[PDB]
Design a protein around this ligand. Structure first.
Ligand code: 44E
Ligand code: 44E
Ligand code: 44E
Ligand code: CA
Ligand code: CA
Lengths: 563, 650, 65
């Protein structure tokens, strides 16, 4: 293509052609899948073009509305379950395959449909009807009961999930309650890991794990194993796509580093040393610091559960969807900080001033040598945005009053830029950002809530992390066979394991015909509700006036002619 | 499924040729080579098209020729073509199976159609499965049908109560569906304006008095306050009645200027004792019936509050306080005079809780502070009398033991001082300038508790962290006052409760640095400790507060267009608490054919009142709505059916 | 509050049919079986319909009878 606008216009015209609802009804033997792949195409191509991004995003949103409006035309729960439960067999049920596909395409306005959400809600509370008698304390007591009850409620499923109570945790909401209860017990053990009622002697290099640490360790392994399990099904494709997933990955890496540093301390520490005499950069200290940071991340990570609660849900979503703006603006803030740090170091480079300043640094009792090196200047310029820095850091141990004046002026310019210019700009930016992320704060929240629900729908990691590492009843029959993949036992899986006739197509064919009939009815209803609600419901333009005028005029002329 | 012989016939209907269509029907019977009830390629029965173009001339022909009617009624009803309905009445589907002509006619809100069906005897199945969305749809299709203004005007003898009980149902049934919530506020807030729009038809103060004073005085308004009908009381001419009743004794109070309003209020404010004692002893004719006037009682009531606090201002002065060092001191003189108000407020509180049964008492976010306001006074009195027995030694306060009954008593009284001084804010609901501001300042208070939930939890996240690092450095041996509130900020991150403290005070920049230092050279431990501290301010101080500003700012906008109607509901709910002659005494002086004729007189008001609404609703919506293509396509068919007739006869 | 001999009369005013309406007002005098100034069920006077359709041709007729 030597020219470019002809080709670009041709491509946009093509997409805008087969993105029309009317054409999808005629062609497109599978309108849902068509709209889905088409929205994906245009969303991923609105960045490749990047000059027509408005048009392509508009078209993708239009076909998303088409998918939602086509799902809307269902008239019976039977008609809905087939739509949500459908997928290509290819000889490979009812586990909401179409809905998971819709999640996979970021079709967030298709899963916010009312009756679809009703189906999911019904399938979430299967253990017990109602959940509408609940109130401020009615729901709390039944959830607190299970949150206390999860140990043996989990053990029952572990050993005897036949008929008594193993199916009671398999149910999704109970699984959620048990998981969040396990997380809360983890956090309780973490808070209690700092009390002196259990802590080991501080004056002991590389001590053996304390009993609380012994209890904590199975949670560490459980979280590591569940994150490896989650990785082994998304293949670092959606794994990185979830920012919560990145946060918990770094948390588990910090836990791994903590275990390694603790044990490598234990192999050679010999103990019996006061903490005030420990050499800097000792494995126990760094292990403790990493453990603390991991505690911070762990206690933060429960924010994700607030997507389930119908009150912190949208608020947490809006929190998430203006974090990008704060990152963009914080990059500029960091650039300005580096600039002023450069200058301030240039100025107070020579006044080293460490003859009597005991414990030199910004973080002293006197804030001395704040600008005497690049690191301390970076750090001092950070703290000044909070006011925790004082003046007289700009003073020097001499009568060089002009140097002090220009340094104070540079520091004041930095403060005016940050706390009066930049921070106010940040506020005025997120004000309009929130003003433009409230129109779809509900639909997007419901999409996130569905994403959280479907994680607990499947019969996968049904076991909370404390009772997850516990080996399966076999435990030596699945790991080995999956380990027999680099040898001849990889091919001994599709010859002797399967020897039957594979009698499934006759069910598959009837299922597909039933789904096709449902699609045919939905499409006919959508057409009959798009002609009668959009064609005859728009405005009256000048052209229609002209047509009516000319109809009258032709009438007059012909009746004149006939006499 | 297409052909060619009827595509002219199907278009002969659409053009509107009476002659050609009549011939095609005639040839249909003899030579069955054409389907009378054909289907358009887009899908429209020959009758279904004549319905759309409102042609009664050819609807007659199709109806007279045994055409398949099908759901043509349901389609005519949706298109609100009145002329076609009489023809159809007197003789796979698009709509949901549960929809019936009366249910769908109420959806369109068309009086002419609705009145015509109800005479035929149609009935609306009143509200109360294995399948979910045939119930939730049908239930919403019922409620939206019987929440329609036009249907309520025909059935539902008492339109006001019907718009009241119903609006309660939808409001309390949105929270149970929780997913059709938007589709239900669309209905509850639709019938909340029906009440206001029917009450506006009143054309005299007489016809207004009957509405409110029906099942004495202001019978119905006491009820609409219960149903949170806040768009019904804010009606202006109704609010005019209240103000003319809230300034009852003395006329005017419009001529008085800025300073004129003030002299005559403070002057009553300084006569509150004598204006209450006169009612206390003899409310015969002189002044005991002056307090009974709603305004004056408010001023006396408000005056008492001010005076009450005034002692709280006095109770802390050294001139009236007792000796500093007195184990369980005897009550001081001002405290003794304080005591009547404490009992005064409790007595009216128990009276308030008696008429609400804790279900209406708990609803106000005021009585939740009023309760703790009083309940901390029992903890004030009980502690002092406990300190008055088995504790009297006149011992210097330095050596007093912690948790001593007086110290608990003094603090718990101090806290109750705040919960009382802040409680006069509710008296600002009356001031027209601080009224809308205060009510709109509390309508987004919830959107701050919802957000100090996160900051209460992020604060736990780092307190979990910084403790886990520093807790091996206690150092609470050398530096006296091993706490945070000291001159030299000792070991702020030492215990869990000290780090909950240390982090909280950091949001105000009150926690200096070097609290992150340690009494050693572990410059890594300090640094990571300082980093955790620093990144806490970034998340909270500059990112969480900023998203709190950016969130109330939006939340304010949704509560601004109704920041006035809400306020007059808060004011009326404050006025009406003084209208009734109940607790009509300030706290310190507090402890010391009968209805058949009325009914048939009130029924004649509603019958005119509703008739005054319908005749003033069609002139405002049925002849004032926008213009759409479906009307334009009618005029073409209106002329084509006329040119094909004038030419056809020549 | 309905009838039959007026519903065509009221429609004739609504349809603008000046031809039929003059007959009813001319046939009313001989046989008082039709209410000239009646009210339709929705509530609109016969003459008020002509006021509503801005049709001067029958307004002059109505006021004339
Ligand atoms: C944008 C950079 C402004 C200069 C900042 C500065 O440090 O100069 C302050 C000067 C002198 O104060 P210092 O130099 O800070 O000691 O005083 C003013 O001019 C106040 C003007 C107040 C202006 C808000
Ligand atoms: C935000 C929760 C922080 C809890 C930290 C803490 O335990 O200290 C209590 C803090 C300050 O009291 P100190 O313990 O002395 O720090 O008071 C409040 O939180 C008032 C909030 C009332 C808000 C209306
Ligand atoms: C927004 C200013 C960023 C500039 C970075 C900088 O000055 O150095 C980082 C400093 C490191 O030095 P400390 O103040 O000791 O933590 O603080 C942070 O880590 C906060 C970043 C955490 C932000 C989430
Ligand atoms: Ca994860
Ligand atoms: Ca009270």
């Amino acid at each position: 293509d030597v020219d470019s606008l002809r080709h670009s216009r041709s491509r946009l015209n093509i997409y805008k052609a087969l993105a029309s609802p009317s054409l999808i009804a005629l062609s497109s033997e599978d309108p849902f899948l068509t709209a889905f792949q088409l929205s994906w195409e245009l969303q991923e191509l609105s960045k490749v073009e990047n000059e027509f991004k408005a048009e392509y995003e508009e078209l993708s949103h239009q076909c998303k509305h088409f998918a939602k409006d086509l799902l809307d035309q269902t008239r019976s729960s039977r008609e809905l379950e087939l739509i949500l439960n459908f997928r290509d067999d290819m000889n490979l049920n009812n586990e909401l395959a179409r809905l998971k596909l819709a999640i996979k395409y970021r079709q967030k306005e298709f899963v916010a449909q009312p009756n679809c959400q009703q189906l999911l809600a019904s399938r979430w509370y299967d253990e017990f009807p109602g959940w509408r008698r609940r109130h401020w304390a009615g729901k709390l007591i039944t959830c607190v009961f299970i949150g206390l009850m999860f140990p043996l409620l989990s053990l029952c499923y572990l050993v005897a999930p036949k008929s008594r109570y193993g199916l009671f945790i398999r149910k999704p909401f109970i699984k959620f309650i048990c998981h969040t209860a396990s997380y809360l017990t983890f956090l309780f053990l973490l808070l209690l890991a700092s009390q002196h009622i259990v802590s080991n002697n501080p004056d002991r290099q590389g001590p053996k794990p304390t009993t609380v640490e012994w209890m904590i360790l199975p949670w560490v392994l459980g979280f590591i194993w569940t994150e490896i399990k989650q990785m082994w099904d998304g293949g670092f494709q959606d794994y990185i796509h979830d920012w919560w997933n990145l946060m918990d990955f770094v948390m588990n890496s910090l836990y791994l580093a903590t275990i390694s540093l603790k044990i490598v301390a234990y192999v050679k520490y010999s103990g019996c040393k006061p903490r005030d005499t420990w050499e800097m950069w000792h494995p126990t200290l760094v292990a403790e610091a990493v453990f603390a940071i991991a505690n911070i991340f762990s206690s933060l990570r429960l924010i994700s559960l607030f997507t389930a609660n119908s009150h912190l849900g949208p608020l947490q979503i809006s929190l998430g969807r203006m974090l990008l703006d704060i990152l963009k603006f914080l990059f500029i803030y960091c650039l300005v900080l580096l600039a002023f740090a450069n200058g301030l170091n240039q100025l107070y480079f020579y006044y080293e001033n460490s003859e009597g300043m005991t414990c030199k640094g910004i973080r002293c009792e006197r804030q001395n040598n704040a600008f005497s090196t690049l690191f301390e200047t970076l750090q001092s310029l950070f703290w000044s945005i909070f006011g925790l820095i004082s003046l007289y850091v700009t003073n020097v141990k001499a009568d060089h009053k002009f140097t002090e004046f220009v340094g104070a002026t540079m520091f004041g310019t930095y403060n005016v830029i940050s706390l009066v210019v930049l921070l106010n700009m940040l506020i005025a930016m997120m004000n309009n950002s929130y003003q433009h992320i409230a129109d779809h704060a509900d639909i997007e929240w419901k999409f996130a809530r569905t994403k959280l629900w479907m994680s607990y729908f499947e019969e996968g990691g049904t076991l909370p992390p404390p009772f997850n590492i516990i080996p399966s009843p076999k435990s030596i029959c699945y790991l080995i066979t999956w380990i027999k993949v680099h040898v001849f036992k990889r091919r001994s899986k599709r010859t002797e394991t399967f020897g039957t006739l594979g009698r499934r197509a006759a069910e598959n064919v009837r299922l597909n015909h039933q789904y096709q009939e449902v699609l045919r009815n939905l499409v006919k209803r959508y057409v009959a509700a798009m002609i009668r609600d959009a064609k005859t419901e728009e405005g009256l333009t000048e052209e229609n006036f002209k047509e009516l005028k000319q109809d009258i005029s032709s009438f007059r002329y012909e009746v004149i002619g006939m006499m | 499924e297409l052909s060619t012989q009827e595509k002219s016939y199907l278009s002969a209907v659409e053009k509107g040729d009476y002659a050609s269509v009549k011939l095609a029907l005639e040839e249909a019977e003899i030579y069955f080579k054409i389907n009378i009830n054909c289907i358009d390629p887009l899908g429209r029965t020959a009758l279904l098209i004549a319905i759309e173009n409102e042609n009664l001339e050819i609807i007659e022909l199709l109806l007279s020729f045994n055409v398949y009617v099908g759901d043509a009624l349901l389609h005519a009803i949706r298109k609100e073509v009145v002329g076609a309905v009489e023809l159809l009445l007197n003789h796979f589907s698009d709509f949901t199976p549960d929809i019936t002509p009366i249910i769908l006619a109420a959806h369109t809100n068309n009086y002419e159609i609705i009145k015509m069906l109800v005479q035929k005897g149609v009935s609306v199945p009143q509200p109360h499965d294995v399948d979910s969305l045939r119930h939730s749809r049908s239930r919403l299709n019922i409620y939206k049908a019987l929440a329609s203004p036009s249907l309520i005007a025909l059935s539902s003898e008492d339109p006001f109560l019907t718009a009241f009980q119903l609006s309660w149902e939808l409001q309390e049934l949105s929270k149970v569906e929780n997913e059709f919530k938007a589709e239900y506020e669309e209905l509850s807030h639709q019938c909340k304006h029906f009440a206001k729009d029917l009450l506006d038809q009143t054309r005299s103060s007489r016809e207004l008095e009957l509405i409110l004073n029906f099942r004495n005085e202001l019978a119905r308004l006491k009820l609409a306050i219960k149903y949170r009908q806040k768009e019904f009381v804010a009606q202006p001419n109704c609010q005019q009645l209240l103000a003319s009743r809230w300034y009852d004794e003395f006329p005017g109070w419009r001529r008085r200027h800025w300073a004129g309003k003030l002299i005559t209020c403070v002057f009553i404010g300084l006569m509150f004792p004598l204006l209450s004692l006169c009612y206390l002893v003899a409310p015969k004719s002189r002044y005991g019936l002056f307090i009974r006037k709603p305004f004056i009682k408010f001023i006396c009531h408000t005056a008492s509050y001010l005076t009450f606090l005034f002692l709280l201002l006095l109770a802390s002065q050294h001139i009236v306080s007792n000796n500093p060092d007195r184990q369980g001191p005897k009550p001081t003189t001002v405290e003794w005079m304080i005591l009547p108000w404490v009992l005064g407020f409790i007595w009216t509180e128990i009276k308030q809780m008696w008429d609400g049964g804790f279900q209406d008492y708990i609803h106000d976010w005021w009585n939740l502070m009023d309760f703790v306001m009083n309940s901390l006074y029992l903890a004030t009195i009980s502690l002092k009398i406990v300190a008055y027995v088995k504790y009297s030694g006149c011992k210097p306060r330095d050596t007093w033991e912690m948790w001593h009954p007086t110290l608990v008593a003094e603090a718990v009284f101090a806290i109750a001082n705040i919960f009382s001084s802040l409680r006069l804010i509710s008296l600002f609901t009356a001031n027209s300038h601080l009224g809308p501001l205060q009510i709109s300042l509390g309508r987004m208070l919830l959107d701050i508790l919802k957000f100090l939930f996160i900051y209460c939890l992020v604060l736990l996240a780092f307190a979990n962290g910084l403790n886990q690092l520093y807790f091996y450095y206690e150092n609470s041996e050398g530096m006296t006052c091993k706490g945070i509130r000291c001159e030299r900020q000792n070991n702020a991150f030492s215990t869990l409760f000290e780090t909950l403290q240390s982090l909280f005070w950091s949001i105000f920049g009150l926690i200096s640095l070097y609290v992150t230092n340690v009494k050693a050279d572990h410059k890594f431990t300090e640094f990571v400790g300082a980093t955790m501290f620093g990144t806490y301010n970034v998340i909270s101080l500059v990112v969480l507060l900023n998203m709190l500003i950016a969130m109330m700012n939006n939340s304010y906008q949704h509560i601004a267009d109704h920041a006035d109607i809400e306020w007059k509901f808060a004011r009326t709910k404050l006025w009406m608490s003084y209208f009734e002659e109940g607790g009509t005494l300030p706290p310190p002086f507090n402890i010391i054919a009968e209805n058949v004729r009325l009914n048939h007189q009130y029924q004649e008001v509603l019958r005119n009142l509703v008739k005054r609404y319908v005749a003033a609703m069609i002139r405002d919506a049925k002849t004032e709505e926008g213009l759409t293509e479906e009307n334009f396509k009618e005029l073409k068919q209106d002329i084509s059916s006329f040119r094909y007739e004038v030419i056809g006869m020549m």
